[PDB]
Amino acid sequence: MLLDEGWLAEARRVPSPHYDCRPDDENPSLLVVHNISLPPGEFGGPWIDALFTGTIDPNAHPYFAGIAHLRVSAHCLIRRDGEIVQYVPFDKRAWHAGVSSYQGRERCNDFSIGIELEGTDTLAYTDAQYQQLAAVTNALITRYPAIANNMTGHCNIAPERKTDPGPSFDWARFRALVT
Ligand SMILES: [Zn+2]
């Protein structure tokens, strides 16, 4: 697919207020793979769109109040059916990695894009999502070369704390489709 220098045309743009300047406007290299579903264990709700914009309703669900204290966002999301939703231009800083670390260098937000796979640590992602994740990845690799040589889980840059994208994530399947 195609890149309007930050934005994915194919997608459904959610204008998240939750971005800012990459420090010294450094360009991204490492892509991190995230997972998420809300409420935790269901798919298709509007609620992800919600969390990612800082508007989600703490009253919509006993699990939504537990996190209604965050302001967080991830560059793009892949829904179970392949649909790509984009909240923030790739060149900008997403509030996704958190307290993370990759190769001596923390605050991994700075230099990374974050892709969310709708799902759970323990349930297989769908064919469409492997096709889509790889699709987006090839694009960013073309814009940002280093990505092909920096790809990881949240669980890698934040062990113990994070386990996403989980043992479900079959890197084999995905890589099989990256350039
Ligand atoms: Zn994550």
* Residue 95, phi then psi, degrees to nearest 5: -90, 60
Query: How many Cα atoms are found within 13 Å in the side-chain-facing hemisphere of 101?
Result: 6
Which pairs from 38-45 meet CB under 8 Å and 24+ separation?
38/63, 38/64, 39/63, 39/64, 40/120, 41/120, 43/79, 43/80, 43/118, 43/119, 44/79, 44/80
- The experimental technique behind this entry is X-ray
Contact assessment for residue 165 and residue 153, using Cβ atoms and an 8 Å cutoff? yes
Would you call 91 helix, strand, or coil by DSSP? coil
Residue closest to 118 by CA, chosen among 82, 159, 150: 82
Burial of residue 33 (CB within 10 Å: 0-12, 13-18, 19+) is buried
| Catalytic residue selected from 83, 116, 118, 160 | 116
| 5 catalytic per annotation | no
SS3 for 115-177, per residue? EEEECECCECCCHHHHHHHHHHHHHHHHHCHHHHHCEEEHHHHCCCCCCCCCCCCCHHHHHCC
Q: Tell me, in angstroms, the distance from the centre of ligand 1 to residue 1's CA.
A: 24
- SS3 label, residue 111: helix
40 CA to centre of ligand 1 in angstroms:
13
CB 154 within 8 Å of CB 99: no
What is the structure's resolution, reported in angstroms to one decimal? 2.0
Phi/psi of residue 108, nearest 5 degrees: -55, -20
**To which residue do tokens 């990695």 refer?**
97
- Give me the residues paired with residue 86 across strands: 13, 76
5: which 2 tokens?
A: 């220098």
CA distance 83 to 139: 16
Residue 11 and residue 85 in contact, taking contact as beta carbons nearer than 8 Å? yes
CA 33 to centroid of chain Cα atoms: 6
Q: Where are the domains of the chain?
A: 1-179
Q: Are 97 and 137 in contact (CB under 8 A)?
A: no
Distance, CA of 77 to CA of 84 (rounded, Å): 6
* Residues 94/75, Cβ–Cβ less than 8 Å: yes
Specify binding-site residues for Zn(2+). Answer: 34, 154, 164
Question: Between vectors from CA 100 to CA 23 and to CA 104, what angle results, nearest 5°?
Answer: 75
Distances (CA, A) of 42 to 10, 36, 57: 25, 10, 16
What CATH code would you report for 1-179?
Answer: 3.40.80.10
8 strand-pairing partners: 3
User: How far apart are the two ends of the chain, measured CA to CA in Å?
Assistant: 12
